[PDB]
Amino acid sequence: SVYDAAAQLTADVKKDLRDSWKVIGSDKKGNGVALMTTLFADNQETIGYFKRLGDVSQGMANDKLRGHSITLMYALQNFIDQLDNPDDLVCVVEKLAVNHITRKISAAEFGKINGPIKKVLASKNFGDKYANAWAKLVAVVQAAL
Template sequence: MSELSQRQKDLILQGWDVLAADMRATGTALFTEIFTRYPAYQKKFRVMKDMPLEEAVKSTRMKGHAVIFMRALQNVILNMDEPDVMADVLETIARRHAELGFRKVDFEACFSRQHTEPLPECLGAPWVVPTLCGGAPSSSFSPLNQTFTMADATGLTGGQKGLLKESTDIMSKDLAAVGIALFGEVFNRYPQYQKKFRKIADMPVDDAMKTVRMKSHATLVIGALRTIVGSVNDPDLTMDMLETLGVRHKLMGWLTKADFDNVFGVLLDILKDHEATKSTSDPAGTLEAWKALLNTIGSEVAKQL
């Protein structure tokens, strides 16, 4: 893996702040251009393979994939100072795409210079990316005008969505640490789950938690939760993400809803005394919001298992 200079890392982070202002719009703009230049890639998406391009890029599936893609890219970027973790995250992404039949040449086509030419301009002009993507960045979420709404398909009220955003903003300071705390306790309570991780199957739990593989997995899991929370103002998008999550876990061949319930039970126990709950504007309400969201995730994922 090529080593990045500190200057390069700083420029990437500076550019990412712009690109991440509206992840859905940025990701959708990218895939619109990819599908325009390489129509064969649209055929890989079963739900929208035969749609006109204009309809495909407006579909819930495309919005969901655009956000998932951008979050995955964010996980790579935020681990630039931990090359081993970044490499493991990339290995996981590579394995998933290899199973779908993608090869190096496909990534090279999607990441070609033509698709990324606007980036240098964006580094000095934060308004360029939103303009290219079809609109201004989304305004920051305010729970104040959402508090009294009824729960929707996500199982959350507007106020709960705001509390979850507060919580995940705190978690984002160190995603890996939250995930390590979660899986350390999961493996202590349910040793059989550690056996599913080949590289750490026979390690003492404390040693397993220090491995690159576990840091990578912890980051991906908590990052996925953050992505789901980031989607809850668009319930259709959230439901599509959860369906995708369920399909991915079905491929593992052994997970059941009971397994998700076990892990989520541990997570709730951790959150009771965690900064990501206690430092929000309403700790008790935040914990209830997590209970509601995790219940929805478990129920929706179970439909695919």
């Protein structure tokens, strides 16, 4: 029910996503890496999916981790840019879901990214209001998994 989940992205939710992304997306390498290292720190078990990245404890210094982290932020950039057209938002979200389904990543597992997002947002002084908005965007992806 991707379209149904997209319906939860109301005018106010879209506004908070764009306002917070204006800051978070301004440093894709820095915030992308912070997002990943926080995920690994708070949910060590997720590291099992990233054996290809090697020594993730290296953080920013790990070229593969950095490459993945920056690339992840462009997926979010893609989503933010499509917010005003649900037909396009839905097709790019389903595109993203394809490889995650193949990796056998469930909606519950994918949702573990909510904690890291909440923390990265707070480090930039974006409170619960914004974290909730982001959880709603993540929920659109969860609906496709």
